[PDB]
Curated annotation (Swiss-Prot), chains A, B, C, D:
Lineage of the organism: Bacteria, Pseudomonadati, Pseudomonadota, Gammaproteobacteria, Enterobacterales
Gene Ontology annotations of biological process type: L-serine biosynthetic process
E.C. numbers: 1.1.1.95, 1.1.1.399
Assembly, per entry: Homotetramer.
Protein name: D-3-phosphoglycerate dehydrogenase
Family label: Belongs to the D-isomer specific 2-hydroxyacid dehydrogenase family.
NCBIfam families the UniProt entry points to: PRK11790.1
InterPro entries xrefs: ACT-like_dom_sf (IPR045865), ACT_dom (IPR002912), AHAS_small-like_ACT (IPR054480), D-isomer_2-hydroxyacid_DH (IPR050223), D-isomer_2_OHA_DH_cat_dom (IPR006139), D-isomer_DH_CS (IPR029753), D-isomer_DH_CS1 (IPR029752), D-isomer_DH_NAD-bd (IPR006140)
Pfam families: 2-Hacid_dh, 2-Hacid_dh_C, ACT_AHAS_ss
Cellular component GO terms, alphabetical: cytosol
Domain of life assignment: Bacteria
PROSITE patterns cross-referenced by the UniProt entry: ACT, D_2_HYDROXYACID_DH_1, D_2_HYDROXYACID_DH_2, D_2_HYDROXYACID_DH_3
Chain ranges of the ACT domain: 333-404
Transmembrane segments: none
Length: 404, 404, 404, 404
């Protein structure tokens, strides 16, 4: 019956999501190359079991209400701000994403930008397109020999460090968790001392109160004069007026910014920034993530996360939902989603005790207000089909399924 | 040594060169940040033992011939077209330079350009300085997994191949001479194959009859649709209008040009190109070697060649002159430069035999119509002074002197 | 926690283990440098909550059954043949160990042996301790450029291959399962080919019907005349008399054996071998894993497994027991071990339902005839204490306890 | 006439010397596998133009006197103590050797020995061959993580450092010349501080007053307790009674020695050392050099050094002779060896001046008492054949040749 399970894919996810899905039997797929209208969406999602969307579709409480058959949501993207998770949670629908499929794409972007920034290319190039010729060597540098200071040594920070070392830089980092340095990286205990020694400082941190304006005047002023600050992390992490002044005073020699406190909503919208007045600043429209390889990594991972929720019930890594996962070890398995309150499990288990059916394995995890329980029982179809009926009738039940 | 020996240094040679000069005793130095006009050049060089210059200074027959005391010429620079080699060799003046002194600067620039060109970054940055936001993934790619086509696997081609490899690209090269690949690089027999296959092609060929318009419309169309072409070898290698067509036709995704058929004379003259209308092209004012690190190596190297030759008469690597070098062992040493014709050498030696002075070592090399010779003899100072004077008189003599 | 929980540690476990134990609150520790006789073992374990042992201590049915308070068993050691798994699982006692805790020690030993065996060094050293000087080059070789034949490309085979490679040997392997090569390693289909080609063959196979006498006279003669055979997998893998013949016949140049069919019981029992008469053989008393670094990792790892399971009931990686682990979220947690038969779980849950205590999370895994379960519930201490007592009464119950 | 030029090769040089020689036309070769008698030597060398010998033939003044046609001597070995250089110098015969063809062989030996020493293998193995079984882990270590202190950072010291780094050691060195560290090596300014930090100290220095007993009691006592000292450099550099005591007090845990203050003259002779009483000492009979690859490297290099002296007159690197070398740049070249006294060169050059023959190039280097001069002249055979006659007649001449 997989062929009767519908997958609606909007905004054109990578073709590899399709391959990895048609490899798992789910062949009933409506694919669109672009974002649907305030209204054709709803018509299309109505009998969809799985929807796959990107950063531009707004999966709002109004729209999820439209969807009578919806089972799980797959965001082929890093963010989920475009989805009402609380809406999906209430209806028993997990939402999955791809928070780390972009690593390489971002590191490689930071290497090229620091190669050309260190060389003054971005300025030479803007003058060139304006018919001005600006040769000089004064203040142009190669990267081999330079110090790179990476702030935030997680997935991307560590790939970058490695890349940079290939080019002969001395990598140095600062993270809040103590870490195990790869290669020759070197942890620095105080931020201010990372800043003083760094020819190039690159931010690779998450978004939150600890990161709101982490790089402000005070921190920028600590940077080594003549240095470059590159930020492809979060738009909230550097102070733009403060960077603008530091660029103006030539205290920095340049910058690359991929993310801004306010980003235009669409390509059609206009982009405005006080940094646009600087030739020696790379400004990109949030594309550190935007490669076909990441599109592909993302395609594979989020489709596999939907395949697994569909096949064996796993909600490992779900964003809005209790995480649960059981090793496949026995024919016959079911799941049950319910209001997290006293007595539900007991009722559930009774359906089998009271008829001599043996429970092989069970995993239950709860949220403030909901529970996911996956159970493996030694029974046959008829018995299960029946237990499923009964489970569905359990006061507090939101939904339940017979996975196999 | 002798703080009387005048060095004229012009066009802002790296300060390293002056440190080297001063560490060797030579303190008498006229330094200029830039070039000089005909009269003040001619004025500064009237009494100069050595000159150091860059590309903007033109030592012509007439110039050199009025440099009364000129002993040698150092081109702090790869090329020597600014200098009249022949004219110097006739006055017995060796010219030195710095042959391969920026292989790394160019390799590294190429790596940064292809990272950003592959990402469509140059365009997005142009557009962003104009208020336009352009967030795509559609033609963007990571460098890892891609094929780099290197045309000309020499000093620079080779060194580029290693960087590219240590970045996960597959490296293929096409060269007119069978070469032994470094790392996992692969030589391709047919230039057409390399083009069709490569995702990025970067030119590294010399300037000569066989490279002129090496990449015209034929060769460009053999390139992978959506690929990229980078050129930081020689202005003469690429049909620039071919290239503008192929770009306007979207047959190439972008390109990066460091050198052009006709380059501006100075930073005041206008830069004109068909390629300036394309946001997706990097134009740089011929800066592949314009790096402090390079200027520094050049400066060390060439002031070195001049000290070694003021001090011990070496001319290993001179560009207009017979190459000779003698290991220092036995105080004193002299040298003589003469027309290359039978009889001189015997004449020269006899000056020593007939007064019973022993000749410790000696090296003579000749060109076409000049010969050169360094001699070591065992004698106190006066005998050397006097014998020198005899050597000047030998028929054929151009120039001679006493080193220590 | 509770400085009352008795750990018995015997056969001189690494001190790291005690540091780990003490950092987690458990200070009540009886440590022994060596093994104990039947009566004092039995005396030390009568009131022991946990035991740590090595290979010389034999926990038999009778032993385990008189360990009144035994909660778990850690084999600080790769193997568990010393321990009665079944007998422990029936008393609801999980046994842990350290699966692959010395891949590196063995790889490194193999590398040092083949460097010296290839050089004929072992012989020259024997001879030199007898007054005899033997200075040859005739059958001596460097490792670089030679072929290493690895039989069994697993944890250790793999890790050896990398070391060998980073030393310039060519690495070939023969394995019964298609494996993906690391570095430039190459899988060979026919064991005979590998033998004929390889200069050094090193065995890394498990002990089982298919490896017994895996290298008898046939296979040895297929080896390269003058080659070398190293074995630090299992005593049972090599026809040792075959091997002595092939050595006396000069068909092999040497060998290195870490393990033998019959090993001495202790450092007092005699070691006998046909191979002892050959100077050109390295004999080692089964020390491929006997390194401080390894003992330390083992010690950290296994005292870890015991703390995690005293504290939160984990049994990830236990060797006789259903594997279950639950992320710590909501104070309190309990666990129950029972015969695996219908009815228990419902019985167990109902204890909570019927008094309105909410069950936060729960994990049950079962084996054959045992089931295991960890539960999180929201209740103050007294209710937990009391409910525990009820759980003990559930029919089927083997053992239960309250973790926090 | 090359086929009429005889090459006598004793002690069995590597077959590659023969290939590289028969590649250059010299095909008239008497090869022996072993060292000739006090007398068959002389019979065989009598009309030899080139002899090639190893460490065991004594090329003494008595024997060189035997040799009427001898031109150059090739020691297919590092040492030349077996040759009377002064004897050969007087007769105009250069002696060549292979001082650096052994690098890899020695480094690889030091790696294997430090692998097994760190493991206590040498002791376990000696007990094993004596029927004693000695398991322990206490004090056995892997190398990854350890500090290696290399004393003398020349050809071998640097190859070793690299090797060691592959195995994960921290390399540290001490040399008297300041050096450029490869990889992650680290120069240490004071010996005593290299010693304190080093788990393994390995000597790689030359022989001379600065090295006589460099490692004496005082220096050994500075070593980190528990460390190992490995010496495959020179027999004069460590104090053997002082090492013996330090091994006795267990201040060191072991050692490898390849060279001794007194080495037996032949395999037949007896070897005696106070270290032979130690199981935990590797003792080798000076075989750090003894591999087929070094035999081969040596074969190629010293045969090529004889080929070049024979073909173009180069004495670059000759051990007993003035070093001289001219680039091939012109048909016709001759050499002349003479007493270093006033007037010889003049006479030589006159032979050409006085007949209109032009000297293209000349290199003359002198010794305390002899001169090598190589000259290139623009003439034809007849003229040269004639000049050769005359040159031979020059008061002070020892020998002369027409190379081509
Ligand atoms: N520019 C773009 O298109 C994209 C941006 N990213 C972003 O890059 C950032 C990092 O990404 P990943 O490394 O993949 O995740 P990650 O979780 O591995 O990186 C977080 C790291 O930051 C360190 N850190 C957290 N707070 C810190 C603070 N207060 N001060 C210093 N260090 C701190 C953490 O210890 C951790 O190592 C995220 O914000 C992620 O969304 C990821 C993909 C694309
Ligand atoms: N962008 C800049 O400011 C600078 C440009 N360059 C230029 O880049 C070029 C490369 O320099 P190097 O690597 O030192 O050159 P190189 O001398 O090391 O190698 C050039 C290679 O091209 C090959 N080659 C020659 N003619 C060819 C042909 N027609 N087709 C294909 N291969 C051919 C040769 O076999 C040679 O291997 C030179 O022209 C150099 O002047 C060098 C430094 C700076
Ligand atoms: N010398 C010592 O004191 C120690 C010995 N060992 C032993 O060395 C052996 C290797 O251990 P690991 O690398 O962890 O093993 P592993 O489990 O990682 O791999 C063994 C490999 O051998 C292959 N294999 C199995 N049967 C085979 C057969 N009959 N013919 C060819 N290949 C076969 C399997 O495919 C597997 O890939 C084990 O027996 C282990 O007990 C391990 C540690 C220390
Ligand atoms: N064991 C064997 O069969 C063989 C031994 N060797 C020997 O190894 C030794 C080193 O060989 P290579 O490295 O190839 O020659 P090398 O000349 O490159 O090594 C000499 C190094 O020792 C350093 N050094 C010299 N005197 C020192 C002192 N007073 N204190 C500290 N450092 C000092 C020098 O600066 C230089 O870097 C030589 O004695 C050589 O004959 C070489 C081949 C085989």
């Amino acid at each position: 019956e997989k062929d009767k399970i519908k997958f609606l894919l909007v905004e054109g996810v990578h073709q590899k999501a399709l391959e990895s899905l048609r490899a798992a039997g789910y062949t009933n797929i409506e694919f669109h190359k672009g974002a649907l209208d305030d209204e054709q969406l709803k018509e299309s999602i109505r009998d969809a079991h799985f929807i796959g969307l990107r950063s531009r579709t707004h999966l709002t409480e109004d729209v999820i209400n439209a969807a009578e058959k919806l089972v799980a949501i797959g965001a082929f993207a890093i963010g989920t701000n475009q989805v009402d998770l609380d809406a999906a949670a209430k209806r028993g629908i997990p939402v999955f994403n791809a928070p780390f499929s972009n690593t390489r794409s971002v590191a490689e972007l930071v290497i090229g930008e620091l190669l050309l920034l260190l060389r003054g290319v971005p300025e030479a190039n803007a003058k060139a397109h304006r018919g001005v010729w600006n040769k000089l060597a004064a203040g142009s540098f190669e990267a081999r020999g330079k110090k790179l200071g990476i702030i935030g040594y997680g997935h991307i920070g560590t790939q970058l460090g490695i890349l940079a070392e290939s080019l002969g830089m001395y990598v140095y980092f600062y993270d809040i968790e103590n870490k195990l340095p790869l290669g020759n990286a070197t942890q620095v205990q105080h931020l201010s001392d990372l800043l003083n020694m760094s020819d190039v400082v690159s931010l690779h941190v998450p978004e939150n109160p600890s990161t709101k304006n982490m790089m402000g005047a005070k921190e920028i002023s600590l940077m080594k004069p003549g240095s470059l600050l590159i930020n492809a992390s979060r738009g909230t992490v550097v102070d733009i007026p403060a960077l603008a002044d530091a660029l103006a005073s030539k205290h920095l020699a340049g910058a690359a910014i991929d993310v801004f406190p306010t980003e235009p909503a669409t390509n059609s919208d206009p982009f405005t920034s006080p940094l646009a007045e600087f030739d020696n600043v790379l400004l990109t429209p949030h594309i550190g993530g935007s490669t076909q390889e990441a599109q592909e990594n993302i395609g594979l991972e989020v489709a596999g996360k939907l395949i697994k929720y569909s096949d064996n019930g796993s909600t490992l890594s779900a964003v809005n939902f209790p995480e649960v996962s059981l090793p496949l070890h026995v024919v016959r398995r079911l799941m049950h989603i319910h209001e997290n309150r006293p007595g539900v499990l007991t009722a559930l288990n009774k359906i089998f005790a009271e008829q001599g059916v043996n429970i092989a394995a069970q995993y239950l995890q709860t949220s403030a207000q909901m529970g996911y329980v996956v159970i493996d029982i030694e029974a046959d179809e008829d018995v299960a089909e029946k237990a499923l009926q009964a489970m569905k009738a359990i006061p507090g039940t939101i939904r339940a399924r017979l996975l196999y």
